[PDB]
Design a protein around this ligand. Structure first.
Ligand SMILES: NC(=O)C1=CN([C@@H]2O[C@H](COP(=O)(O)OP(=O)(O)OC[C@H]3O[C@@H](n4cnc5c(N)ncnc54)[C@H](O)[C@@H]3O)[C@@H](O)[C@H]2O)C=CC1
Ligand SMILES: NC(=O)C1=CN([C@@H]2O[C@H](COP(=O)(O)OP(=O)(O)OC[C@H]3O[C@@H](n4cnc5c(N)ncnc54)[C@H](O)[C@@H]3O)[C@@H](O)[C@H]2O)C=CC1
Ligand SMILES: NC(=O)C1=CN([C@@H]2O[C@H](COP(=O)(O)OP(=O)(O)OC[C@H]3O[C@@H](n4cnc5c(N)ncnc54)[C@H](O)[C@@H]3O)[C@@H](O)[C@H]2O)C=CC1
Ligand SMILES: NC(=O)C1=CN([C@@H]2O[C@H](COP(=O)(O)OP(=O)(O)OC[C@H]3O[C@@H](n4cnc5c(N)ncnc54)[C@H](O)[C@@H]3O)[C@@H](O)[C@H]2O)C=CC1
Ligand SMILES: NC(=O)C1=CN([C@@H]2O[C@H](COP(=O)(O)OP(=O)(O)OC[C@H]3O[C@@H](n4cnc5c(N)ncnc54)[C@H](O)[C@@H]3O)[C@@H](O)[C@H]2O)C=CC1
Ligand SMILES: O=C(O)[C@H]1CCCS1
Ligand SMILES: O=C(O)[C@H]1CCCS1
Ligand SMILES: O=C(O)[C@H]1CCCS1
Ligand SMILES: O=C(O)[C@H]1CCCS1
Ligand SMILES: O=C(O)[C@H]1CCCS1
Lengths: 279, 274, 274, 280, 279
């Protein structure tokens, strides 16, 4: 029974993430679409067209988003953030909570830019992922220097309506980016390959995609609702000498586990590397 | 009414001049190319087509309105110092050299006359069959009509779109080097056909036709390349068995490696220039 | 004046009917296709084009002069037992099924009427953009004009040549499965473009255009694919660096592996049929 | 012929494998009398020295004697020895000398800098050759230095063409030539050893396998040199569809055979550049 | 000063090998081109066009080649040999020496076919390679049951005019096929790759191809003219710590030697496998 009646939300940037969050927020019923505004310099985007059909207000002018909004999501690519902050810094007011969703971009770099215009900008940094669009996101956030305690509580309330959400220290966010930020892409890759495996063994592609996705969804839910180690859940599937343990062996023979560690590491390191180039 | 020149009379200049004249947008007599070796195979070819040839880059500049630089990247600075005093208000200088930045070209030419009109492009050899892939970036002093003239000319020999200059090194790694990746693949596919009993000539023809048709399908489709792949393979069938052996060798990762390596080498060469 | 039927209304039947009608060689109303699932996506598409649809394979046979079999290979014997008593002296039966031999088809149809006119072909999905690659072999009772009619029809949607039947399983591994190899390559090349900073849409477009143009160059050239590769790479340049990383992963061997695996699976499936 | 009646005196500083191979080639070509060649080394107990002596080449421990004897003077010592050599006999280089450095990686610039401290216009040529000059099938490139006369390059090409292929190049290609044709014979000997092992594994006597493998390589190389066709086209002409050769080419491809040869040319070229950076 | 004045040579098959041998024989001066006849069912072949320009007599009819010829080379693909022998078996005469160049095809299988028409066919089996076209071939031959001692001597004389030639026991020929029969293709592959290596390091392709080919030619000649082991010749190239030994290491790290053994083995095994399918 959650609903933010006095809250206006804006998105600077109207792409994949702004669409996913706006769709998730409106489906959760915590925000009416007409209380959301998004800005983009390209109104011929498929996400812009989708946001319009939801009822979200659209404008080319970032200043209009700022003037409309209380909670302001920065949903542009990381290298665009400093340009955005230069553009609307003079328009940030005491009432604004600035939530940066940009990969890698530090609270410090945002606060430095905005502080040149008005002291004490209220800044929150978050890392989320596209499954907020089906209200099953994974979101972490860190509060900035001037964020009030009620600001973090409000953001956790809002972002919990579209999936898991918890506060972290900011120095964990680049690693979260490599795990759950990039994570859905690892899963989409895995599901494409599992479906290819099903097709190879005789299944129609449509059925293979449905079954592989249901298997992943079910297993993830089991782990979330269980207190047992994933190794123990794995042990429950494989009967001695059976089909599953034969398949697990071929995964191990290819270093399957190491590839996933490699992936989380590479996304995290690239996230750190990009920000060091920014600074 | 346009007059076009090429500094350099090698593979790219031939490919572009053959495409332009085949497209009809340019008559061979409006094209002049220069090279210090007038006994080159490509120079002989351009002569048969009707293109004017000269050893003197100054003559090419004097006749051209649009001037293409089609020499190797390390030669661009030498060329710019030889012809810089000959550039005029009318000239559009189109650099085709891999890696060479608009800034480096504009710096050299500005020592002689301010506001040189510079465009940088990355194209590829299939312009010779009017199926090239071309991107271009406009310089500080290019007029808006300069970019439109450029896009009109290069669209006649393939795909053409404007990009920001900071994308061009990556384009080089993808569509600039791309034809070589395809020629390697076609040689190997033909070897596979021969191993399974096909005459070499038929294998080359079938492999090339298969790649051409698939590329055309993807260009004409709004569907994802993975969806088009799913349409080929029946469950349990021959295609999905072959796709597995490609995946087992990391086929996808090799092509990613290639684009990266070409792009990185392009960036590395230009850092050496600067 | 020709009437064409398809038994099966799936991906291949759609692709061939779209190519035929786009080529102008066949009006959509002269084509009938049958399928047991009239709520298929491809069946809806054929209906929009003007193709006649029916659930009854007998109706397709009754209207067709040329009859394409475009069902999965394990279904061919079932189809031949359902329609065998309906084949006539006028019919040319064109089997498109992977692996299925002319001998197996002629044996089944001969139980009903002697001298069935049978042609086996291997084509691919790019017939839908009239750039298919098709081979065909004529059966024991096909007249000489039957092969010429077949080549005329299939040349309208791509390359077409007659082969001995014992080459068709290898052709399957090369140009039949080939589009899937190209779609995989194009997905990966686009990923490489994105890694180096290109938007995904531009990377897909440039990669596909590069492969299309290179394939067209090879088809229009008498030069060896290795010679065309040599023309792309400058000494020390970006392309030769990328070619090295392809060679280091055994890129060529993977494509040979793929053709072999598809051909072998085709042979294996037909041995299972027999 | 014309070079023979030129009665050239040749010297080698260094009496090792390259000096032996060149001396053997020049004398077998009839361009030089063995006794018009002089070679020096501090180690007069080397096998190459005994072979040179048996040939009739003049041997001396004293590099100055080689210089004074010579009209064309080959520097055939290890790359890191070249600067010591140039310090030692630099004062003995005369205006009549053509100094030909064979040393891997050593630049014309580095040599001219040493020698210019003594006479102002030392005539320097840099070359890269290989051991098959010993059977007059060498592969040789050379670049002319700042003060080499046009006749000096032509004389050098005449001389080195008598023992194989020879062509002028820009100096900045020579490190790459080193990795290809300089080191190349060692790749070929490795390949010939391995091909012979393959012959032996399949049942051939070793002597026959070595002979057939070497003859195969020689004939294939000669074909390519005498053909205007691409090596891939010549390869295509060997393999029938489904046949033995295309099966063998597949297993080469599956091992990255091509990439190994690229790796080798690269590795030798890079090592050549890396040593010279250590020098300069 | 060799010349076979009373010898007429025929080729059944007018493809790559017939062209290479006819070009080699005529360049050696041991045969006039007009004393050579070749037959093929396809007179629109590039090799047929090349043979015509040399002066070689051409016919579509294999029977004409047989009637013209004394020495008859079978230069068709191995699976065509039994069809050929059926076709012209009745036309073999006492004077004919039948030389089969077909990979894998045994003397026994040829003699069995031809003996059904006339006893004691004179059969020689040979394995050669395309460098006979530059008179640097590598050829072995085995004499059949009814070949006279002068027949082998004559064939060794003829084939020695286009390269190395020696007699072997027939059971060595499949292995020779894997080594020197297929060998030129291994070399063309190696030269293409070496040239790519030169281009990568800055050489023009034309120069790189010329230098790589000269290097291989020179090294092979050195080995042929030396009594030393190839390992010893290799040692003479590499100075301690130098460029060559660095390159040899990277070849060894990739198992370069094993790939060449693999190749000879695979060609030999395929040659045996094909013939077992023939029989
Ligand atoms: N897509 C994902 O999976 C997630 C993305 N993120 C972060 O969200 C941000 C955006 O990601 P996507 O939405 O995927 O990017 P996207 O590229 O889909 O949308 C980007 C939007 O920014 C707009 N834009 C460009 N310049 C602008 C300007 N000057 N003012 C306003 N809008 C401008 C573009 O027109 C486009 O609408 C990035 O920083 C990314 O790290 C974080 C979590 C997950
Ligand atoms: N060939 C390709 O696939 C493409 C090449 N490019 C770029 O085009 C340029 C040349 O490419 P290619 O034509 O392949 O090189 P190329 O080597 O075939 O032709 C180069 C031409 O420049 C001439 N040249 C050398 N010095 C000269 C001088 N001082 N004045 C005038 N002409 C001179 C050479 O004689 C030769 O004719 C390079 O910058 C390359 O990056 C870009 C896209 C594709
Ligand atoms: N899709 C491709 O890339 C190509 C496929 N082929 C061959 O074409 C045939 C089919 O290929 P796709 O169209 O991809 O299969 P598909 O599965 O897309 O269409 C198969 C059609 O057969 C219909 N069908 C099933 N049982 C039937 C019956 N008893 N009577 C009539 N119709 C029936 C199915 O309902 C479906 O519409 C296969 O033999 C395949 O080897 C050959 C070349 C290329
Ligand atoms: N061996 C080869 O394959 C080729 C060698 N080269 C170059 O030729 C040069 C020598 O090569 P190798 O003859 O193989 O070396 P090597 O070591 O066989 O002969 C070197 C000779 O230098 C002599 N030497 C050492 N210090 C000396 C000094 N202070 N004064 C005079 N002589 C001295 C040694 O005693 C020995 O006789 C090297 O620079 C190498 O890069 C280049 C082309 C091919
Ligand atoms: N190309 C090579 O590197 C070498 C090939 N060989 C052997 O030589 C034989 C031929 O090899 P290539 O010449 O490369 O084949 P190829 O395919 O170049 O020439 C084959 C010739 O046979 C002709 N032919 C087909 N049916 C015929 C018939 N019924 N009567 C007469 N001629 C007919 C074809 O029209 C063509 O002219 C094969 O058995 C092969 O094993 C042996 C040593 C080396
Ligand atoms: O014992 C096994 O592995 C079976 C149970 C899980 C699916 S297969
Ligand atoms: O894989 C399949 O189902 C067939 C499709 C066309 C070539 S093989
Ligand atoms: O490799 C090269 O020399 C350039 C050719 C076009 C793309 S990069
Ligand atoms: O077709 C082939 O591969 C044979 C040719 C000569 C060596 S084996
Ligand atoms: O010592 C070395 O390896 C040099 C001699 C051969 C070419 S490079």
């Amino acid at each position: 029974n959650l609903y933010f009646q006095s809250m206006s939300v804006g998105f600077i940037g109207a792409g994949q993430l702004a669409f996913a969050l706006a769709k998730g927020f409106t489906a959760a019923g915590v925000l009416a679409a007409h209380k959301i505004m998004a800005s983009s310099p390209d109104m011929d985007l498929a996400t812009v067209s989708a946001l319009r059909k939801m009822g979200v207000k659209l404008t080319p002018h970032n200043k209009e988003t700022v003037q409309h909004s209380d909670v302001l999501f920065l949903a542009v690519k990381p290298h665009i953030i400093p340009f955005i902050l230069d553009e609307i810094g003079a328009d940030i007011e005491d009432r604004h909570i600035v939530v940066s969703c940009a990969a890698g971009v530090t609270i410090s770099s945002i606060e430095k830019k905005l502080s040149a215009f008005r002291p004490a900008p209220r800044v929150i940094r978050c890392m989320t992922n596209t499954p907020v669009v089906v209200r099953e996101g994974a979101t972490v956030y860190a509060t900035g220097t001037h964020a009030q305690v009620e600001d973090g509580r409000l953001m956790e309330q809002l972002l919990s309506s579209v999936g898991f959400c918890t506060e972290v220290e900011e120095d964990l966010i680049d690693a979260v980016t490599g795990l759950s930020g990039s994570g859905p892409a690892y899963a989409f890759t895995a599901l494409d390959a599992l479906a290819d495996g099903g097709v190879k063994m005789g299944l129609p592609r449509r059925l293979a995609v449905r079954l592989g996705a249901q298997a992943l969804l079910g297993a993830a839910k089991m782990l979330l609702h269980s207190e047992q180690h994933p190794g123990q859940l794995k042990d429950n599937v494989s009967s001695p000498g059976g089909a599953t343990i034969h398949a697990l062996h071929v995964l191990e023979s290819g270093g399957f586990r190491s590839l996933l560690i490699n992936a989380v590491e590479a996304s995290c390191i690239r996230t750190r590397e990009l920000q060091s180039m920014a600074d």
